[PDB]
Amino acid sequence: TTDSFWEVGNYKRTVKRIDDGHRLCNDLMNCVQERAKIEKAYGQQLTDWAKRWRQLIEKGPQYGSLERAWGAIMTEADKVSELHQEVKNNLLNEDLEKVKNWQKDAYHKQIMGGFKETKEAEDGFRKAQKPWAKKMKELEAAKKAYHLACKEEKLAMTREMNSKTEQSVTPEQQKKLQDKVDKCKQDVQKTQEKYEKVLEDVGKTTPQYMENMEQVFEQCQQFEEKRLVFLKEVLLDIKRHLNLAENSSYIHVYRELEQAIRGADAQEDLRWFRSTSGPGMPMNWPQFEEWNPD
Template identity: 70%
Template sequence: MKQHKGRRISGSDRLNKDLSVWSPLGPQYGTVGRAWFALMTEAEKVSDLHMEVKTALTGEHLEKIKNWQKDAYHKQMIGGFKETKEAEDGFRKAQKPWAKKLKEVDTMKKAYHNACKEEKTASSRESSSKLENNNPEAKKKLQEKVEKCQQEVQKTQERYRKSLEELEMMTPQYKENMEQVFEQWQQFEGKRLHFFRELLLVIKQHLDLSSNHKYSTIYHTLEDTLQAADAQEDLKWFRSNHGPGMPMNWPRFEEWSMDSNQTLSQGEAKRKHADGVTQQTEQTSKTSSSVPVPSSLNPFDEDEDGEDEEEPAERSESSPVAEEVTAQTAGTVEKTAAAGSDEEAGNPFTNTNSNPFEDEPCSPCEVCVPVRALYDYEGRGRDELSFRAGDQLMEISEEDERGWCKG
């Protein structure tokens, strides 16, 4: 049961590992995205069922076995079990009289066979002396020896037969006594076999996931979710959120106000940044500090899931779209293309981050240092990575004042 528990834990860990590897991957969205995550959820729920089986195997049933063993088998200080010694003593006591008589019969049989052997030898010598024409005195001695051996054979034979008859008379009582002891321990063994049979049936119920309604519900739910995936509905959603049907924010006339003096233009922000001026703003997520710069000429409000989740931007109250500028220390110069030109600002369709599946180019300020995770971490926000201990990551920026970096 303990080994089976280990296999259940190992299987659960493998399912959880597959879930952590495949769950964040893929550009799925909409109904197909829900189908994708439903498949990941299946692994998680099956993993939970394996852990339930593990708990059931090592819970009350294992404790029940220990209690039964403690009640049925009592250990002795000198070693072994009390019940084993009682069984051996019971059989030994039941067969002791018969065994004693059997030993006597074996002794009588041995004496009779030895007497027969001596009688045979004496007869051979007597026959040889008759052929060799020995003196009468020697022949007489050999003849007396033969007669004496014959008498001994007769005597030992009678003793042997008598002992055997006595043993046969004791055999019924011996069989009765042995059967009583046997039945006593047969009942003991029957209780053990019955206990284990019932226990194995209970364990089978825990191991048989096909009879678990939770197990069948997992795949019924999974099939319903997969069948509900609609490609046309997802295409329609993508068109409405990331295509021609998405909400537009066309440029319009804005009246001057005192607040507008406090907002830096894109060009001014880059010039100050190149001169070594550090601009930092407080962000709700734990990421690198950045300066929000308005871009009021961008007609697209792109706040959907397609945006890069690791670099969230702060929105300005006076602008529908804000561009993030990474804060640098004095003396650091960021060499970037002149993306904030007047020609691009006047184009309502200019949007460098409109493709959610396109990798963001690395800037010269990034460090690109390979690092390895020391512990498991689950991201608590859209801008935080999730990883497992031992995963290799790439650090692409220095730590900020709060100890966070990009990767």
């Protein structure tokens, strides 16, 4: 657990959380316009289709009702395109804009450093960790000293046993073997009293450490929460604006196309042609013609 929140210098992860917040806003904005582009393309593709074929049918050999039928399928194209433009718009007028604004209130860059709120936190954390930071260094100092002190007690306590294995003219060196082994014995007992002293000491200051880091933290959560809430609301706003269905207009388009079509009557059609281009049209039959004369 060297990667735990309580380990000195780890609150940083949640400090990052903040710089991230602004960045994700950024992201949602880029997502939105991208959507728009797509929505603009479709409906712009649409009217370009409506026009081409509107003109084609009107210049064309088609006639009568069938012409108007096949006609209406261009207004569809148009109406739908107008919707997808409605859609583009909102993504860009409301939804996008909302984010751009919210992001302008929550975060503010500062000339020296990053965001203001990022600092306020970053300092809050240091502040609450300072005390525990100091102590925690004492601690690893004393351990470091005490271990060393126990390594030396084993440096001479066994060495004496190796030096008295020589048993060769060392009455002055036999006194040093029992001199250092009892000197280091002092160190060990001492360091274990100092180190142990810090240990119980740190234990008296952990709650305070805890209340502390836990206070700057809940304050962080507060701010996070403020964007998480907003963000959800944005995403609803978007779904709303993306949704064509449950939009009267949309359904309306395809009822209107439908009846235009069924409206087509080949009979009336056929009759028109008869009267307009066929035997139905008047004919001057040969008649006895006198001289003009001029």
